[PDB]
Amino acid sequence: ALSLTADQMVSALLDAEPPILYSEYDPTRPFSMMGLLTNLADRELVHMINWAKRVPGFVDLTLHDQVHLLESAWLEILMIGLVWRSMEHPGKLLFAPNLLLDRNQGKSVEGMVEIFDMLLATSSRFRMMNLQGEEFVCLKSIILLNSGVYTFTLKSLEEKDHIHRVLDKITDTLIHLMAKAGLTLQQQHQRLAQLLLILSHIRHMSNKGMEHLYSMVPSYDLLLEMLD
Amino acid sequence: ALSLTADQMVSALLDAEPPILYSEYDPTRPFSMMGLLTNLADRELVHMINWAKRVPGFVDLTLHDQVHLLESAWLEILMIGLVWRSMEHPGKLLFAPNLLLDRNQGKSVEGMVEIFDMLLATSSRFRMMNLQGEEFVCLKSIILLNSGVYTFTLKSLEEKDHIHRVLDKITDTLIHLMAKAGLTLQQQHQRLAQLLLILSHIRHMSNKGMEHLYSMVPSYDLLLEMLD
Ligand SMILES: CC(C)CN1CCc2cc(O)ccc2[C@H]1c1ccc(/C=C/C(=O)O)cc1
């Protein structure tokens, strides 16, 4: 994992990409939103576990640490996936190819339109930056490794060190992608910063989303069971 | 602001630094924690407004946008300040020079020890990275400009553009500080990323903190009044 080249890292992440799932509803029947979104999120989680195990360095960690990282990051990962899927659909959120929802549709649940608006704005930011697929997969892997790394013994110190080393490799990779695309050294650092700063907003969105869900979520046990 | 050199940006930010305030309690009297922390935060906010107005580019924005940015960022700014103050005090949070609290003291309020632990871990991360004062002031300014920029008309488009341009200048500045300190180009990008990724955790901490406070906060009107 730490011996991978930038090109190899990118290829590994692109290969690890999960599929785009569909919403489960009878399309011949008349058009609950939260039920549809929950069932979709449930099914995506399984594929996210598989994806996570294919992110270089991730399976080198202890099971306990893998669970902690996924516990911290899962909603951020679903959200960045959603925002990426929605990028070329101004004003809409592509939850699934058969479930493309606008802001007005979000108003059907109390507190939801606020979250829809933040996701739509992130998609807008992605569009304005012209985010590339190779950059997106790097960012999603960064979320997985970074979100829980500040909230964790000699083994723990080794785990955190490894995580930072893998994150450094992904940073190198992002820069390499920007250098290959022809950006100047200045533009490279600037774009790196712009991309990483969006991750703070994705964290914010996830926290707001978790508040919504807790006001009504995969347990440590379910995640542990799925990862073990 | 956009014509400032890296050295000028750093100097401007160092000059803008607010003072370290003291907790208001009778030190001759026997040792409420939340009351002490709230009163401290109240007084710090006033100085934060002054500081914000001295961050290059900030007063170029509309009053409304200044308020929005501060509304989004104020707790993150208090927290990064706290973590910086605490950096050379392992296991303790230096809320003020006369109010140095350990994790055990946080247990006196339900839900607080969790927040103390996250802040202490961030201080630990700062210590391990050997964060420099010049880097800290850059990061605090980045929080101010970035935290609310995704949640905002032709004027709004101009405002967001300006904010991104100022953020790009601060990125250039951070890199310049790392280049002057003798880091390689690789190390520069890596450290930039490490620093910006901590900001995601600071956002997380602020969200957790706001949840605590809302379960019991400066209004738009107070912030507007103070900024106007
Ligand atoms: C209020 C948010 C949590 C709604 N999110 C937005 C992000 C997102 C992305 C997806 O790609 C699929 C669904 C969603 C939904 C969502 C809705 C419900 C749940 C609930 C999960 C559970 O209760 O286990 C999770 C996410």
Ligand SMILES: CC(C)CN1CCc2cc(O)ccc2[C@H]1c1ccc(/C=C/C(=O)O)cc1
């Ligand atoms: C639970 C957290 C919000 C406690 N924080 C931690 C960060 C911090 C940094 C400071 O430098 C000073 C105080 C604090 C406290 C804190 C406590 C109360 C309030 C309340 C403010 C209000 O009610 O206006 C804000 C922050």
